[PDB]
Amino acid sequence: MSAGKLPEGWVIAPVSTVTTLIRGVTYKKEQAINYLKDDYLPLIRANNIQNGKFDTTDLVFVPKNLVKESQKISPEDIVIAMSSGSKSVVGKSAHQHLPFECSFGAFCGVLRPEKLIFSGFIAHFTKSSLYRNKISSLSAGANINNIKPASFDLINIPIPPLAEQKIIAEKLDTLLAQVDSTKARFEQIPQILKRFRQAVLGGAVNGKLTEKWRNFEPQHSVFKKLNFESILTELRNGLSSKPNESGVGHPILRISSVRAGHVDQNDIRFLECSESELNRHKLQDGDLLFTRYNGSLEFVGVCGLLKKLQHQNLLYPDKLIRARLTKDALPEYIEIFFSSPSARNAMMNCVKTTSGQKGISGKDIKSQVVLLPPVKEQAEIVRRVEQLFAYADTIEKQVNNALARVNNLTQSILAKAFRGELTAQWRAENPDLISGENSAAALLEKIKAERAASGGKKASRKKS
Amino acid sequence: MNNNDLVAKLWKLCDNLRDGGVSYQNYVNELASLLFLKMCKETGQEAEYLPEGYRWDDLKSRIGQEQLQFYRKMLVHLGEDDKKLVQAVFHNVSTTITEPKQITALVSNMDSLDWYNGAHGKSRDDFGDMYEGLLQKNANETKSGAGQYFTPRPLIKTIIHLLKPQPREVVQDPAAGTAGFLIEADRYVKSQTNDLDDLDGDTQDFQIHRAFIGLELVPGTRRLALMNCLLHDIEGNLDHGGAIRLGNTLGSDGENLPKAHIVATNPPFGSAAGTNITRTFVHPTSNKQLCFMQHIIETLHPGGRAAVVVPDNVLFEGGKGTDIRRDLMDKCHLHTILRLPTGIFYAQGVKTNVLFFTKGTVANPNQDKNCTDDVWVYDLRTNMPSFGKRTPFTDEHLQPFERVYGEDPHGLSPRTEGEWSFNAEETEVADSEENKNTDQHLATSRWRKFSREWIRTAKSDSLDISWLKDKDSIDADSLPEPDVLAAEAMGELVQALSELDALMRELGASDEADLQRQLLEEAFGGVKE
Amino acid sequence: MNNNDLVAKLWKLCDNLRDGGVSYQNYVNELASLLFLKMCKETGQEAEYLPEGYRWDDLKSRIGQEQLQFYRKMLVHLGEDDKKLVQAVFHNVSTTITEPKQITALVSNMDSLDWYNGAHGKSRDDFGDMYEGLLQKNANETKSGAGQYFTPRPLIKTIIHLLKPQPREVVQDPAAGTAGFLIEADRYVKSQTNDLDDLDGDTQDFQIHRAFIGLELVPGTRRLALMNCLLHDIEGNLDHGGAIRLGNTLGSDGENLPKAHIVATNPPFGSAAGTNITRTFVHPTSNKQLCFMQHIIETLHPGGRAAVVVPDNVLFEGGKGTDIRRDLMDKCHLHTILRLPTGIFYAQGVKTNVLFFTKGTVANPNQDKNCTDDVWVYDLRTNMPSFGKRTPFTDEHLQPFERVYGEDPHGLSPRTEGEWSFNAEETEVADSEENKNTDQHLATSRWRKFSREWIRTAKSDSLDISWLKDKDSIDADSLPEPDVLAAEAMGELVQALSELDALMRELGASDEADLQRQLLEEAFGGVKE
DNA sequence: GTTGCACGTCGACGTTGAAC
DNA sequence: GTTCAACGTCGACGTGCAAC
Numbered sequence A: 001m002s003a004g005k006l007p008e009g010w011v012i013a014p015v016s017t018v019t020t021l022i023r024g025v026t027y028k029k030e031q032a033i034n035y036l037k038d039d040y041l042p043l044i045r046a047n048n049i050q051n052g053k054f055d056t057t058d059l060v061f062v063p064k065n066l067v068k069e070s071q072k073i074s075p076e077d078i079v080i081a082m083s084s085g086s087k088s089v090v091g092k093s094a095h096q097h098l099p100f101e102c103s104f105g106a107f108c109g110v111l112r113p114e115k116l117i118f119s120g121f122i123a124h125f126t127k128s129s130l131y132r133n134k135i136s137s138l139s140a141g142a143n144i145n146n147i148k149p150a151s152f153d154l155i156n157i158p159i160p161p162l163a164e165q166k167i168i169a170e171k172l173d174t175l176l177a178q179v180d181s182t183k184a185r186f187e188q189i190p191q192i193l194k195r196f197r198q199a200v201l202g203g204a205v206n207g208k209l210t211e212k213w214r215n216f217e218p219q220h221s222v223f224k225k226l227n228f229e230s231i232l233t234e235l236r237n238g239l240s241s242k243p244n245e246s247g248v249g250h251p252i253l254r255i256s257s258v259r260a261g262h263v264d265q266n267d268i269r270f271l272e273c274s275e276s277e278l279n280r281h282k283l284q285d286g287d288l289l290f291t292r293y294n295g296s297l298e299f300v301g302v303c304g305l306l307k308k309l310q311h312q313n314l315l316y317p318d319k320l321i322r323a324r325l326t327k328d329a330l331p332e333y334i335e336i337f338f339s340s341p342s343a344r345n346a347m348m349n350c351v352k353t354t355s356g357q358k359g360i361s362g363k364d365i366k367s368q369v370v371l372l373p374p375v376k377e378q379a380e381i382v383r384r385v386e387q388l389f390a391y392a393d394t395i396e397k398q399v400n401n402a403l404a405r406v407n408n409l410t411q412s413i414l415a416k417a418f419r420g421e422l423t424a425q426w427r428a429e430n431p432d433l434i435s436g437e438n439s440a441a442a443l444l445e446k447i448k449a450e451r452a453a454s455g456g457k458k459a460s461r462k463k464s
Numbered sequence B, C: 001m002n003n004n005d006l007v008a009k010l011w012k013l014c015d016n017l018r019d020g021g022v023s024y025q026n027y028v029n030e031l032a033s034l035l036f037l038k039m040c041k042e043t044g045q046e047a048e049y050l051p052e053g054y055r056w057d058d059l060k061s062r063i064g065q066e067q068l069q070f071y072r073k074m075l076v077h078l079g080e081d082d083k084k085l086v087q088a089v090f091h092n093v094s095t096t097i098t099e100p101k102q103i104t105a106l107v108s109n110m111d112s113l114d115w116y117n118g119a120h121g122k123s124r125d126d127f128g129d130m131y132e133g134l135l136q137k138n139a140n141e142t143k144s145g146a147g148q149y150f151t152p153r154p155l156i157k158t159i160i161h162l163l164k165p166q167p168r169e170v171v172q173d174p175a176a177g178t179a180g181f182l183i184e185a186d187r188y189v190k191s192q193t194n195d196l197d198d199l200d201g202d203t204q205d206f207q208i209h210r211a212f213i214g215l216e217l218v219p220g221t222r223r224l225a226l227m228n229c230l231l232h233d234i235e236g237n238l239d240h241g242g243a244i245r246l247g248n249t250l251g252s253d254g255e256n257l258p259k260a261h262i263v264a265t266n267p268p269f270g271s272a273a274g275t276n277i278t279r280t281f282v283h284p285t286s287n288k289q290l291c292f293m294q295h296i297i298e299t300l301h302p303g304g305r306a307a308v309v310v311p312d313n314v315l316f317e318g319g320k321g322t323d324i325r326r327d328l329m330d331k332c333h334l335h336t337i338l339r340l341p342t343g344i345f346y347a348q349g350v351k352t353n354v355l356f357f358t359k360g361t362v363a364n365p366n367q368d369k370n371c372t373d374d375v376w377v378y379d380l381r382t383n384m385p386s387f388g389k390r391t392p393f394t395d396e397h398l399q400p401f402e403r404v405y406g407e408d409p410h411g412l413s414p415r416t417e418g419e420w421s422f423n424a425e426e427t428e429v430a431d432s433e434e435n436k437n438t439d440q441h442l443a444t445s446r447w448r449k450f451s452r453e454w455i456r457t458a459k460s461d462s463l464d465i466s467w468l469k470d471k472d473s474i475d476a477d478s479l480p481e482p483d484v485l486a487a488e489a490m491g492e493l494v495q496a497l498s499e500l501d502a503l504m505r506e507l508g509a510s511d512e513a514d515l516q517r518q519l520l521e522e523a524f525g526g527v528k529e
Numbered sequence D: 001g002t003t004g005c006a007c008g009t010c011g012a013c014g015t016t017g018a019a020c
Numbered sequence E: 001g002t003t004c005a006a007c008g009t010c011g012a013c014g015t016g017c018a019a020c
């Protein structure tokens, strides 16, 4: 019992004792040209570690500069950490394959002694949450929003035998690879979805098509403007001072709500008295939603659709804009159309980022180009699109559990990798013992019992 | 303080100042002077208050540069004269206003202004109150930079409340600023005294003149503070000009300042304003804040007490900071530390704390060393609602802390650990010496105590102490008591649970607590082996 | 107009000003006055320049408030007097410095200062240049807010370059500010003239006094500008105090201002400083910027020319903005528009443009309407390197624009579309009316022209014209000419390609251009059907 | 009813060089 | 050599009410 339950084999030692050298680095006089000019040796900054493994160096740092600067040359296969940039306390780590390099103050190099400790072992060890928890003890820190190297040295870590450290690290590495694989498939699916978006809207299901004002389109479809089909409304906000308005019972939907997504309800609402005096616009369900301020990434548009049973209705602020479909239209179909990037391209070209920005004019929206498919066809298209999105969500979940699995393994391995039993393989004459799924477990159990019994001979075996 | 319609009214006037060249920080100072002159006229008594030739009409009538120059001239004339009462207000006073057009507009605007925020009788107090409130807004504003002075109102209330200043006691504020603390302290005393009615006349005079003292480096700030006290009826010393003296704490003025029974102050953070540290200290340091701390220790009388708002900076800082801290614990008895939440101050990033300690010890007021045995800490900061305009910081937040704090001003009152407010239980716990060998329930508590030896050994004499972790996660909570005790242990024990679940599924055991315990009995023991 | 060691030296002095209460914006003004007095003494001739009783020694010797008050007095005395030469500099001058300690420190500091940035002979010019450079830094600084005045140096150079001001021509700057444009214009003229040596004495006098004129609302700013011109040897009119007059453009002063052949100015963005629009215009508007535009049109002589920096706001804004915009095209011949990149100005968010137009037309200088037939636009903004301290904005960036612009100041020179600088080709093309019926190559070009009728119809008289997208993507580029022509068409045509690839794989066709063309011939035609 | 911003205000990641 | 910040640098996401 110490930092945590620790096995017989292991000892608890500080990193300082285990590590040959721990030191920071510094920054050179930027003003002088000569220091940077024509330089051979690599220079590293905080950003470097963050981006992947440290293969490359963004900046270059001359040795003349080196002499003058505290910055030093670090050995290869060296662990590194970042003082700043964390959830107050955490810390970062990295390894450097490339030849000896230098860094700055935030970075702290650490060298492990030969065969004393593995670089790989330590790297995972620090990564562990237990490691984080230990550090979190200091707190956000008072006057320090960084990790002090001195504090770093203080850290105590358990030490495995050399053999196990290699084996243990190997196991962890493998998991990391697996997560990456899932990620790849995930990325691909939106690409596929993207293609559908373009093809379906423009192409439609037909086969006979003709030239159109708005690109090549099917013969059956017809063209119309937004204004024809829908109506646009503008809206105003009340005065905060009057508390009377503060009473409520009727919803008001701001852009922030829009950001949230589909919107049945809103965080803030306004009173009927407000609607009467203010003369706000009331909205029925199934109505379209659009975002007038914020813009988005510059001049772009956002959409949403209201929901209601006979029971409720919604009103919104100035920031949001509304549109109503007269007789014939499928709200879901239209909404997807707006979000389509094709619209984005049309819109952006028409207006580049200008002073009027982070917002859309009413004129722009009304003038917008749109196709008019048949009702039945529209419904069919809409259903298809919505379905695809669901798939993306499921994959994300799968990744999450996998991460959880690692967490569990790492925890067990921390305690167990720490026991001598881990270095040693289970006693078995034949490899077949392990081979069976069940058989391997059984063998483990037998070994454990036998070993314990033998250990019983001396207290020291268990005790030490 | 309070403000409403009047502050809005005052705010509009500031627009002229803004356009004038006056800084946001100096809006109040500019307004205050003009209002004072205006009010004097309104009194009708102004001949008594102001000198002839320099009055509201004189300034009012003038226009343009001619007016602006007159204003400057008037300021100088007022500041220097035997009539220290008025002169103090005017001492080191000057207008920031460059644009002549602005001044004319401003004077006329306020001139036409009403008693609008007033009451039966002249509400001179209302103006001052509104003035402070407006000042508060500026203090709140980031752009102004006025915020350096800014302190939370509830914070001040609580500090004085804990201190419980009594009459005949001298309260000092090295960084008086607006004299927020002094006014609060005065208010506290009066509330007890029935407005000093309870006290005899001699004592009453003491409170009015002698009881409170303050020092302000900036003349501009001092003016504001003086006016504040004036409306507050805190006359102070005429020789000095009033309650708030003008001078450098770090300089000769600071040492010259009198000793005080109680000290409540919020010193400036950062390098601070132009304040050269001409004065020597036990441990010389570049740290301005550290310098103040040494000053506070010095001024306090034996057995004195004080609360100091300090940046988190002071708590751990190595080098001299360590030495000074050690000095503090030796000379003073530092009983309590309060860790403030963030977003409260005008500045966002800053972490702050409040220190509570006594000069020496109650038993031995002249105890040079080993004064501080145990320290209590309250974690108000972690896992807290983000404060802001939307989420205000109020007195209620503070109430739990004060309760545990104890009525005794010295902090002597009985204390026990065990505070779980603000969803303390829900918050995550850190792994370490802090929560080492700590039980599950205790680890969660915001209120905890630490030994001096522990701080020395584990902390290495670092005040920066904390157990908790800022997160938000959900996990079933079934653990053994010893498991919870060791924060680090949890990871290992948890791993065992994962496997157990799989076995249970095959068994088809029902979901019951007893079943879980039975399984845990065997499984748990195995891990120990 | 450069700075180095001296500017750093000056910068240090500002620290006193900072601590003093002086704003960042007013550092230069404060320094400039003191330096002027100091320099006068250095001349040894000061008796000639300054009045007795008010000199460097008088100020220098004094200390504290006594000194500060002396300073204010001195400023007033200098500003008002028959000696307009000196008085102009001092006109409407006042010091922002509140803290008396700061003033003493500051005076002494500079007093001990060397000619450090100097040369053989007194380098009065060096100080002024360093002064401007330091001012530039403040202008660059966001916190100061000085940046409102700030304009890119290369931008000014280019503007004057295109304008090609000649001698005997009157150049005006409604928003003179520091008089950056005027100095540049003067420099341009001299460079041509051999420092006016080429010109006769009469003309020379004209250039010195009459040639350039400017107006500044803020007295503080005006002082700086005056000093700038003074070192620049631009005397201007003594009655007015010099080249830069003090007054409101939007007010009576603006109308009083003389007509000018050429106008180059960067008016303030936003609501602007306290400037009431007392003056009537053809189309009254709250828009300050729009107001300036009307002024510029008015002052220009028939056949006059001007370039104005304006925000995007002006281009698109409806309401009166449309009316004014229409008015501009009718009265003036707006040939060119330059879309500036972002990050160049002190303010980050702002989008700016440069308008080029002539009063009426060359053929008919007094042409009331239908002046503007065609407009050329240059998209310097999209797909551009982010500028910043790290990535400076230089003259080189501008060079391509000027080339296409044409030597003719009127903009009459021959022009053709077809500019692909700054990776124009790589930039993404967007789908809209501007790139409607546009070929692939043309769409990419930064330099394009638009018809008046088109602007009227499609744009609905909106200047905000823009063809390109800001993105970064990679896609194979094999398309038919008609496909590329229609931006919108691309999506549809591209879809066809996807299927084609699959078929090709089965065929096992080799990867050759000819093969692709053959397949495209049949496939492409099908889509058309 | 509704329009406009040298915009007004709010999270994410790490200072860098003067100081000793 | 290296230490420290009522933090310094890069964004992120939308004004809201006075004005007409």
Ligand SMILES: C[S@@+](CC[C@H](N)C(=O)[O-])C[C@H]1O[C@@H](n2cnc3c(N)ncnc32)[C@H](O)[C@@H]1O
Binding pocket: B147, B148, B149, B150, B151, B174, B175, B176, B177, B178, B179, B180, B181, B215, B216, B217, B218, B221, B247, B248, B249, B250, B251, B265, B266, B267, B268, B269, B272, B273, B274, B275, B276
């Ligand atoms: C945070 S403010 C105090 C606010 C005060 N608690 C209140 O109620 O408004 C810190 C003050 O310290 C002052 N100060 C800074 N350096 C000083 C010095 N060397 N001597 C005296 N006062 C100083 C500042 O001018 C500032 O007003």
Ligand SMILES: C[S@@+](CC[C@H](N)C(=O)[O-])C[C@H]1O[C@@H](n2cnc3c(N)ncnc32)[C@H](O)[C@@H]1O
Binding pocket: C147, C148, C149, C150, C151, C174, C175, C176, C177, C178, C179, C180, C181, C215, C216, C217, C218, C221, C247, C248, C249, C250, C251, C265, C266, C267, C268, C269, C272, C273, C274, C275, C276
């Ligand atoms: C962007 S600055 C001009 C900078 C100038 N191009 C330079 O070289 O430094 C705009 C100027 O307009 C001035 N200004 C604002 N309102 C004005 C008004 N109503 N009349 C005259 N000048 C005004 C400001 O004081 C400011 O100096």
